[PDB]
């Protein structure tokens, strides 16, 4: 048995728009932050700081992908493409 291409995609869309959990894994995110925070050598962090960075980052990425999807639909496409992200970030003012 197979579900037809796109059906499980919609299923995931529904379930992940219903849930509220975080999607990115904490240890890789932490290693990334503590790598790119090397600005000032030998830093220390509160956990709530990284907890806030992850929230802000995931919110920003979701808000960017929404406009990416809008651009892709405007182009009469289903598949999103990097040119859509570039257009979104060009109109957004970045």
């Amino acid at each position: 048995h197979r579900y037809r291409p796109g059906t499980v995609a919609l299923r995931e869309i529904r379930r992940y728009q219903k849930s509220t959990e975080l999607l990115i894994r904490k240890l890789p995110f932490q290693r990334l932050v503590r790598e790119i925070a090397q600005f000032k050598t030998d830093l220390r962090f509160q956990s709530s700081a990284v907890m806030a960075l992850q929230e802000a980052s995931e919110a920003y990425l979701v808000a960017l992908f929404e406009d990416t999807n809008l651009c892709a639909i405007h182009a009469k496409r289903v598949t999103i493409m990097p040119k859509d992200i570039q257009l979104a970030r060009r109109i957004r003012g970045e």
Binding site: L32, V33, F39, A52, Y60, I80
Partner: protein
Amino acid sequence: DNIQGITKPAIRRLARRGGVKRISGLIYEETRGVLKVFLENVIRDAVTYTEHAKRKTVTAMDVVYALKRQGRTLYGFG
């Protein structure tokens, strides 16, 4: 090289929450760069606040102020 730790399933799940049905194979290298730029800006501002505050430890209020500076205004961390 910890930017490769933001895995393809992770980005796919974020797109699913964003409402995307079909994803090109080239979205991930762009998403990683955008995330890197955003994090670099915010972390730069936070570290600046910390260095002004004469602290070794980067607090959460520093991150909140850094986001308020750019116009994000995160709630829930004081």
